[PDB]
Structures are given as C-alpha cells and as structure tokens.
Design a protein around this ligand. Structure first.
Ligand SMILES: [Mg+2]
Ligand SMILES: [Mg+2]
Ligand SMILES: [Mg+2]
Ligand SMILES: [Mg+2]
Ligand SMILES: [Mg+2]
Ligand SMILES: [Mg+2]
Ligand SMILES: [Mg+2]
Ligand SMILES: [Mg+2]
Ligand SMILES: [Mg+2]
Ligand SMILES: [Mg+2]
Ligand SMILES: [Mg+2]
Ligand SMILES: [Mg+2]
Ligand SMILES: [Mg+2]
Ligand SMILES: [Mg+2]
Ligand SMILES: [Mg+2]
Ligand SMILES: [Mg+2]
Ligand SMILES: [Mg+2]
Ligand SMILES: [Mg+2]
Ligand SMILES: [Mg+2]
Ligand SMILES: [Mg+2]
Ligand SMILES: [Mg+2]
Ligand SMILES: [Mg+2]
Ligand SMILES: [Mg+2]
Ligand SMILES: [Mg+2]
Ligand SMILES: [Mg+2]
Ligand SMILES: [Mg+2]
Ligand SMILES: [Mg+2]
Ligand SMILES: [Mg+2]
Ligand SMILES: [Mn+2]
Ligand SMILES: [Mn+2]
Ligand SMILES: [Mn+2]
Ligand SMILES: [Mn+2]
Ligand SMILES: [Mn+2]
Ligand SMILES: [Mn+2]
Ligand SMILES: [Mn+2]
Ligand SMILES: [Mn+2]
Ligand SMILES: [Mn+2]
Ligand SMILES: [Mn+2]
Ligand SMILES: [Mn+2]
Ligand SMILES: [Mn+2]
Ligand SMILES: [Mn+2]
Ligand SMILES: [Mn+2]
Ligand SMILES: [Mn+2]
Ligand SMILES: [Mn+2]
Ligand SMILES: [Mn+2]
Ligand SMILES: [Mn+2]
Ligand SMILES: [Mn+2]
Ligand SMILES: [Mn+2]
Ligand SMILES: [Mn+2]
Ligand SMILES: [Mn+2]
Ligand SMILES: [Mn+2]
Ligand SMILES: [Mn+2]
Ligand SMILES: [Mn+2]
Ligand SMILES: [Mn+2]
Ligand SMILES: [Mn+2]
Ligand SMILES: [Mn+2]
Ligand SMILES: [Mn+2]
Ligand SMILES: [Mn+2]
Ligand SMILES: [Mn+2]
Ligand SMILES: [Mn+2]
Ligand SMILES: [Mn+2]
Ligand SMILES: [Mn+2]
Ligand SMILES: [Mn+2]
Ligand SMILES: [Mn+2]
Ligand SMILES: [Mn+2]
Ligand SMILES: [Mn+2]
Ligand SMILES: [Mn+2]
Ligand SMILES: [Mn+2]
Ligand SMILES: [Mn+2]
Ligand SMILES: [Mn+2]
Ligand SMILES: [Mn+2]
Ligand SMILES: [Mn+2]
Ligand SMILES: [Mn+2]
Ligand SMILES: [Mn+2]
Ligand SMILES: [Mn+2]
Ligand SMILES: [Mn+2]
Lengths: 131, 42, 199, 60
RNA sequence: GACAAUGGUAGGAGAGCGUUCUAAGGGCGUUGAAGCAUGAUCGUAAGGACAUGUGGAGCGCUUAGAAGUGAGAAUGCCGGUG
RNA sequence: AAGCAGUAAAUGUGGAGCCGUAGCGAAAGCGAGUCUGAAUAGGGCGUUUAGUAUUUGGUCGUAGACCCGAAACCAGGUGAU
RNA sequence: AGGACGACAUUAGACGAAUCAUCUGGAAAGAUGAAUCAAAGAAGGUAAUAAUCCUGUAGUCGAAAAUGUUGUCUCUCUUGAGUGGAUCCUGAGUACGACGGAGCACGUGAAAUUCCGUCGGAAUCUGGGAGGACCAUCUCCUAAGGCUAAAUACUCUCUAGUGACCGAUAGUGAACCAGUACCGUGAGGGAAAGGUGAAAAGCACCCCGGAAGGGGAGUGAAAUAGAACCUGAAACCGUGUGCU
C-alpha cells in the first residue's frame, strides 16, 4: 500500500449495473415490456385479486420472560451467580439457569427460577440457590 | 368563542358546523347600556 | 525487536518496540478500506442541482394539448426543455461511513509495520524556538515526505510546518493516510513508547 | 424510513426460518364436514413466502 | 498438443472500452497544451496512437476513488441552415 | 447510538441500546424440549451450536423513485374597457 | 425597579522575511546554472508556469469617536429560622354528569387521560384528584391564578472561510443597467444577449468608391487577433477541377 498503488481486496467491489445506456449492454427497454414496467410501477405491495395474506387470527400477550443460562455454567471457577453479568450473559428480564450440557463444578447458583434438571445436576455437584 | 367542528351523522360522514353559543340583550354593569349577555353567566 | 534509537547525526542508544504493533506484518485489505474511508470523510457534499419543482419558472401548459401540430408539453421547465429542470442530479449528502473499531486498530498497526518493514527512524529530541534548522535537522538522513510523530502537542516542533514535505502530529493523532502518504516516519521516543502502549 | 410491518400478520408467528400459520375455516358453518373439523394444525407458506417475504419480517 | 462448443428477441450472467472530477506517484508543454482539420496507422469490439496543418496555454500517463458517464428516433426543447 | 473531545477528519471516548448463545404454546408456563393430549401414545415446531459489525453488487419497500404527456379537482386572487 | 468609575470585542488601519545570471522568446515566473528566506511554500496579480517582482500570507501593533458585552465599586430592596395543635383559610357556576361535538398514536369502542357549546351541578384536609371503564384497598399527587432563562427551530442580512458543486443551452429567471425587452385590461407570464490584445499600440499615408467595402503601406508575436474581433466543428452555399 503505497497510495499510488492501492489495491482493493480481491472479490470485494464490482461495478454497478447501468441500465438504459445502449443496447449491446443488454439493457435498453431497460427491463420489462409493455406492461406495468411503467415508472409508477406499483405491483401492489404483495397481492393478486384474492387476498391470501389473510385467513383468520389468533392472539394475546401479557408481561413476562426470563434470560437463559444453560448448565454450561461450567465455565466459571467456584461459588456465586448473577455476577456473571461480568463473564458471559447480557440483557436479563430475569435470570433462569436451564439444563443442557452436563455440569462439571461445585458452585452456588444464586438465580431467579432454576430449571428442574439443572437443579438436580447443580445439587448433585454441591450448591443450589433461589431468588 | 370557538366551537367550529364536524357534524357526523348516521353514516359517520362529516360536514363542518359551528356549535353556536346562547346570547341575549342585557342591562349591563360597567355602564347602564344594553349589551350582549352569555347565558351561562346569568 | 530492538530499534536503534539515535539523535541528530551520531548513533544513540536502542529500544525494543512491541512486535504486535510494529511487526504486525500488515493486513492489506483492511488498510485499503481504511484509506478509502478517511478520504470518504474528508469529502463535504455541497453539490446540489435544481429539479423541475425548483426552477424559477412556472407551470402553465405552454399550449393546449390537442390540435396544434406541436408535441404535447407540460411546463417550459420540464427536463427536455433548454432551461428546464434537472433530473437526478447531485444533492447534498453524507459521504463518510463507520468501520468496526478493531479494524481501525488493525489498520493502524498495519500502516506502522508497513513503515517498519521498510524504514522509520527514532529520536528523543526537541527545542525551544522556531527555525528552519529542522531542514538542517535532516542531517539525520531522512528522505522526501515524512511525518514527525511526537508525544503530545509540541508547538515549535510543529512550526517545522511550512517545510513542503514535512507534517507533524501527536500520536493519539496518527492517521492511516498521513502515515502512508509518508515514505518515512520518526516517532520520537516518548511517542514511540506510547503508540507501543496504545496497541 | 424503516419499512412498516404489515399488521395483518398478527396472523403468523416465526418458527426457525419458516412462519407458523393459522388455518382454514375455524368458526362459522360447522354444520358441514366432520373429519375436516379436526384440522386444528399449522401451516407455513412455501410458494407464498415468496410473496410475503419482507412484510412480516421485522417479525424476527 | 489433440478434442468438443460458439444463430438468437424479452431476459439472466461475465469481461471490458471511452468521458469529467479526485488522490498518490511519475511526466509533457510557448523549441507550441487542449481543441480543430487531414492521413494509405494499430487492436477481436467499444476504441488507442502517430505525422502534418491550424491553434496559442494548458494537458497526459500509471494505480485506486467517485460520478450531472456515453443519444438517432420521445409529432422531444433551444439554435443554425436547407 | 446520541453526547463529550478533535481542524466541518479516522478516532479517542460513550455499552443506553441491538443482534446472537433455546425452543415450544393464544396464554399462564415449562424448558433441550414443548404443544395438542386422559396417555409415561402418536403427531407439529424444535435440540445435534455460528454468529455479528462494516461494506461492493443484485432486488424490494418508503419516498414523484426511469423520463415526457391528460381531460380534470381544490384553494386563493384578477377581470363587465 | 432607572443611573456613575475600566477591561475586552465590533465599526478605518499599520508593520511584515528572502534572487540573481544565461538560453529560447513578443514577453520569462519555464530550462539550465549557481544562491537565499520560512511562526511567512495560503491565495491572487505581473507580457507564459514566481516562497524571495507586486498585493498579500505567519506573526506583531493599533480606536478621536459611536454602539456592544462584561469584571467592581457605587445604587436599591431586604428579619430569616422551629414547636404546638383548638376554630379559620387554602382559587363555586369551577371539578364533575348528561347531550352534540372536537382533541389524545387510540376511528365510541370496555374508552381512562383533555378541551368546546348546551342545559344540570359538588365537596371543604376524617377533604378533592390520579393510578386506561368501574368499586374496595394501597401508593402517588394537591386542579379550577400568573411569571420563568439554557439546551431547540430558522437565515432576507453582516463579516471570515469552505467544496472529488456549474463553467455561458450549465450555474440564479437574471455572469451583460432582469423581473428588463416583450406579452396581457388585470392578477400575471418573461427572454435572449459573456471572451480584441500584454498593452488601443483600434490601421498615419496613398489608392477605387457618394458611402459601404476593399487592395497597398503600417501597429502587433499574431489582424489567415481589424472590432460582427480567441478557438472557429457540422448542416448549408460557392469557385477550381483528376476520373467519370
Ligand atoms: Mg387477517
Ligand atoms: Mg401562462
Ligand atoms: Mg397541456
Ligand atoms: Mg482521450
Ligand atoms: Mg504529444
Ligand atoms: Mg515561434
Ligand atoms: Mg481526404
Ligand atoms: Mg483523425
Ligand atoms: Mg506552426
Ligand atoms: Mg497539433
Ligand atoms: Mg498566453
Ligand atoms: Mg504525455
Ligand atoms: Mg475508477
Ligand atoms: Mg430529434
Ligand atoms: Mg413537427
Ligand atoms: Mg428550429
Ligand atoms: Mg445493498
Ligand atoms: Mg416533494
Ligand atoms: Mg374554487
Ligand atoms: Mg359599460
Ligand atoms: Mg535575443
Ligand atoms: Mg503555522
Ligand atoms: Mg502565484
Ligand atoms: Mg408571454
Ligand atoms: Mg386575457
Ligand atoms: Mg402570457
Ligand atoms: Mg471567420
Ligand atoms: Mg462542376
Ligand atoms: Mn458490468
Ligand atoms: Mn437482451
Ligand atoms: Mn415501448
Ligand atoms: Mn410485463
Ligand atoms: Mn421500470
Ligand atoms: Mn410518474
Ligand atoms: Mn394493497
Ligand atoms: Mn374526513
Ligand atoms: Mn412551481
Ligand atoms: Mn395548476
Ligand atoms: Mn407537422
Ligand atoms: Mn437552470
Ligand atoms: Mn414466542
Ligand atoms: Mn365436502
Ligand atoms: Mn450467441
Ligand atoms: Mn452454430
Ligand atoms: Mn445483468
Ligand atoms: Mn479538459
Ligand atoms: Mn446524461
Ligand atoms: Mn464536538
Ligand atoms: Mn412423545
Ligand atoms: Mn416429539
Ligand atoms: Mn420430529
Ligand atoms: Mn438500490
Ligand atoms: Mn420481485
Ligand atoms: Mn426503483
Ligand atoms: Mn507591507
Ligand atoms: Mn514581501
Ligand atoms: Mn529572471
Ligand atoms: Mn498568467
Ligand atoms: Mn495576520
Ligand atoms: Mn366521564
Ligand atoms: Mn361525549
Ligand atoms: Mn376523538
Ligand atoms: Mn376524572
Ligand atoms: Mn388500574
Ligand atoms: Mn390550590
Ligand atoms: Mn406562559
Ligand atoms: Mn461571503
Ligand atoms: Mn443562463
Ligand atoms: Mn462557449
Ligand atoms: Mn403592453
Ligand atoms: Mn481583454
Ligand atoms: Mn499588408
Ligand atoms: Mn510587425
Ligand atoms: Mn460570427
Ligand atoms: Mn487568448
Ligand atoms: Mn475568430
């Protein structure tokens, strides 16, 4: 890189298509023919003449939702929990420790809502916690 | 004072109206001379 | 990787500069995208042109639509007319774009190590006046274009300014470009140690 | 402008890639077809996700 | 070195030519730039040079960037002249 | 990110925020599973880890959204020489 | 709730570094030689392309006056705290309801939160309101009086700058005495049109011609730069003609 010998990374960057500049180019109708390849061009947005983006409806929603840490809690050293917001977890509406993997440590699982299998494995090692 | 608004009717189509206030002749207080009078006051 | 620090002619001591800043062995594609970025940013976008809505003309139909023998027309300011509105010209806009941070740091090391794999001299020094002795201070060999890198702002040293090819910033400064329009560099000593410290 | 999400897709919910969908003829005229009636079950799109693609798509 | 394939409209995909601006490098120019004209020149194409005349002051080249980037047709708009 | 700093800068700060590491159900909720289900049946979605930021190109949406063209509508004026 | 003593800024300005020779030339700032300044190698000009020829530039200095903004003295106006709980006081046609509207992202809807007109119309700190119909509880407030800088929005104007913005069919409609010729009764609509040369040195004089215009002779590097003036493409118009 010597500023008069700049060379952009291989396979990045490719010349934009320019429609409507000639015929040999392969684009002078530009594209379409006769139809609504007119300028306004509205297809409609997503439709035919028979609306199938609608059949019936099913819905509701209340407040809830937690944040999952799997029994791959076997990363950290010993004792403690919730602190690991400084190690490996980010946004938490509330922090639940699920099962999955297989525990390899003895440590306090101070958290809100413990998944059952995970509780059996964490307790099979040593520590447990709640709230 | 004010009162301009729509007048929706049955089909809920709108046409502008006025919401007119009541008024009447009055003996007045500031100087014994006939004056318009707002009804809600008297 | 000891760099052989020296001062204004004769050799002086030596210093071992960190090899994962000065010996990155440059990654070129990042350095390219950084250079193009910084140029992207130096551009202000003050070009603009007047479309038909904008032109200081009207919009009567120039003539009745049928039975004239002329083409139909809309305004005298529609785009085919001489004096008419411009279709899709330039308008004012942002030009510059963001790049991930680590890429910027990778870029910086790459530029510096490129400067190391060829040549980039070191010297602990500086003075309290204002003279074209700096040109005479290229008795330190040193080539055509270059920057004088320095620890913090050093007005005076900086007033080696109007000497054509020379440029002279901090080290918390240090552009990707200035660094490699450069041909030769000279992080002084304190500074060399700080760029070494700010990986 | 961020594209507006279609709100008439309060009618599907994202699976993993594919969208799970409502069905058929629930409610009215149940006086007809009986094995039919046990068609409480899901859907997707296939041919149609081509059409509806980016509208229910800030539904991620 | 053999051996295959290579008509083609809507249309997909690929490689490129030329224009203006910018960056860096490297050059040309009153011992004549650009432009204009003329030529029996070169490349598979777009297109590139050269020599002469005119001109009298600016312009190429490499590599990368970015575009008001390419006209023969719109009863297209303006000018000139049939 | 805004903001602060810096010469209308490639550039340091700022971790609010956002996407991702878990899914399934209208939901309560449960969780490598869950939903339907009396079922420890069957079946649906899902687990067997690769994402994320920037960006050249393609295409879509929002904008007049390739360009030129109505007859007409509305609003405010100007006209009985 | 109005006025007396100086700092800085605005409205003229001043200082401001360092080049000479030859070649080519109409003219050098170019070329080639040796030089020099630089807190000044920004820019524009000078007969071609100038850091040192000029205007300037870095930097420094500067205000009789008139606003302008502030530092500080004068000038006014000023009694600030706490306990106690007995009876007063805390904004009356208001809050609120009904009806017809209107506004809240929210289309009357389960429709709270808020305004309008029209009739109805309260309570009184054992009070009143809110917490998305509504009621109990709990929590949070105190409506029906008023004032309140800064961060924010905008640019007809001023000064100082900037551009991978136009370069005369472009860029303002308008680079030219443009809202002008011109058009309309009027509201209104609205153009085209920049370039001699370094310097006017803008052709003394003779010639044909009433003049126009021209050929000499001259100015100039160039007038095959002569004013309808740089370059001067194409259509189009002519004279000459080698082959036909
Ligand atoms: Mg629906
Ligand atoms: Mg008209
Ligand atoms: Mg018309
Ligand atoms: Mg060319
Ligand atoms: Mg040449
Ligand atoms: Mg000559
Ligand atoms: Mg010929
Ligand atoms: Mg030719
Ligand atoms: Mg000649
Ligand atoms: Mg020539
Ligand atoms: Mg000249
Ligand atoms: Mg050349
Ligand atoms: Mg390019
Ligand atoms: Mg034509
Ligand atoms: Mg015609
Ligand atoms: Mg014509
Ligand atoms: Mg894209
Ligand atoms: Mg618009
Ligand atoms: Mg009307
Ligand atoms: Mg009459
Ligand atoms: Mg001579
Ligand atoms: Mg300076
Ligand atoms: Mg100059
Ligand atoms: Mg007219
Ligand atoms: Mg008329
Ligand atoms: Mg008219
Ligand atoms: Mg001529
Ligand atoms: Mg003939
Ligand atoms: Mn291409
Ligand atoms: Mn084709
Ligand atoms: Mn067609
Ligand atoms: Mn079609
Ligand atoms: Mn189209
Ligand atoms: Mn259209
Ligand atoms: Mn539709
Ligand atoms: Mn309406
Ligand atoms: Mn208009
Ligand atoms: Mn109109
Ligand atoms: Mn005709
Ligand atoms: Mn225009
Ligand atoms: Mn879900
Ligand atoms: Mn049937
Ligand atoms: Mn073919
Ligand atoms: Mn064939
Ligand atoms: Mn294509
Ligand atoms: Mn050019
Ligand atoms: Mn074009
Ligand atoms: Mn700032
Ligand atoms: Mn099962
Ligand atoms: Mn299963
Ligand atoms: Mn399965
Ligand atoms: Mn696009
Ligand atoms: Mn499509
Ligand atoms: Mn489009
Ligand atoms: Mn001076
Ligand atoms: Mn001087
Ligand atoms: Mn000289
Ligand atoms: Mn000049
Ligand atoms: Mn100054
Ligand atoms: Mn109510
Ligand atoms: Mn009501
Ligand atoms: Mn409403
Ligand atoms: Mn209320
Ligand atoms: Mn509530
Ligand atoms: Mn009160
Ligand atoms: Mn107020
Ligand atoms: Mn200005
Ligand atoms: Mn113009
Ligand atoms: Mn021109
Ligand atoms: Mn007139
Ligand atoms: Mn002149
Ligand atoms: Mn003569
Ligand atoms: Mn002469
Ligand atoms: Mn002419
Ligand atoms: Mn000239
Ligand atoms: Mn001419």
């Amino acid at each position: 890189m010597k500023l008069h010998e700049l060379k952009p990374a291989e396979g990045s960057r490719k010349e934009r298509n320019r429609v409507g500049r000639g015929v040999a180019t392969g684009n002078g109708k530009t594209s379409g023919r006769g139809h609504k390849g007119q300028k306004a061009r509205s297809g409609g947005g997503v439709r035919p003449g028979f609306e199938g983006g609608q059949l019936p409806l099913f819905r509701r929603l209340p407040k809830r939702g937690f944040t999952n840490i799997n029994r791959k809690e076997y990363a950290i050293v010993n004792l403690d929990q919730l602190n690991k917001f400084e190690d490996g977890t980010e946004v938490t509406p509330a922090l639940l420790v699920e099962s999955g993997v297989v525990k390899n440590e003895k440590s306090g699982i101070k958290i809100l809502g413990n998944g059952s299998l995970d509780k059996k494995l964490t307790v099979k090692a040593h520590k447990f916690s709640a709230s | 004072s004010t009162g301009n608004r729509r007048s929706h009717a049955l089909n809920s189509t709108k046409r502008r109206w006025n919401a007119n206030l009541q008024k009447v002749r009055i003996l007045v207080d500031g100087k014994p001379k006939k004056v318009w009078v707002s009804a809600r006051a008297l | 990787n000891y760099d052989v620090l020296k001062l204004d002619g004769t050799k002086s001591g030596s210093i071992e500069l960190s090899d994962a800043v000065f010996g990155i062995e440059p990654n070129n594609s990042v350095l390219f995208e950084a250079i193009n970025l910084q140029r992207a940013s130096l551009r202000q976008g003050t070009h603009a042109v007047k479309n038909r809505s904008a032109v200081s003309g009207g919009g009567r139909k120039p003539w009745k639509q049928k039975g004239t023998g002329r083409a139909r027309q809309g305004t005298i300011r529609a785009p085919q007319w001489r004096g008419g509105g411009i279709v899709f010209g330039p308008t004012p806009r942002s030009y510059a774009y963001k790049m991930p941070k680590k890429m910027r740091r990778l870029a910086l090391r790459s530029a510096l190590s490129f400067k190391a794999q060829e040549n980039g001299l070191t010297v602990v020094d500086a003075f309290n006046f204002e003279a074209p002795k700096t040109k005479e201070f290229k008795n330190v060999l040193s080539t055509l274009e270059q920057p004088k890198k320095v620890l913090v702002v050093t007005e005076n040293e900086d007033v080696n300014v109007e000497l054509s090819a020379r440029n002279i910033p901090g080290v918390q400064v240090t552009t990707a470009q200035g660094l490699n329009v450069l041909d030769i560099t000279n992080a002084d000593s304190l500074v060399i140690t700080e760029a070494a410290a700010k990986k | 402008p961020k594209m507006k999400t279609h709100r008439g897709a309060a009618k599907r919910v994202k699976r993993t890639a594919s969208g799970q969908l409502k069905r058929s003829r629930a409610f009215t005229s149940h006086l007809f077809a009986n094995k039919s009636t046990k068609q409480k079950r899901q859907l997707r799109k296939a041919r149609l996700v081509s059409k509806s693609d980016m509208k229910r798509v800030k539904q991620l």
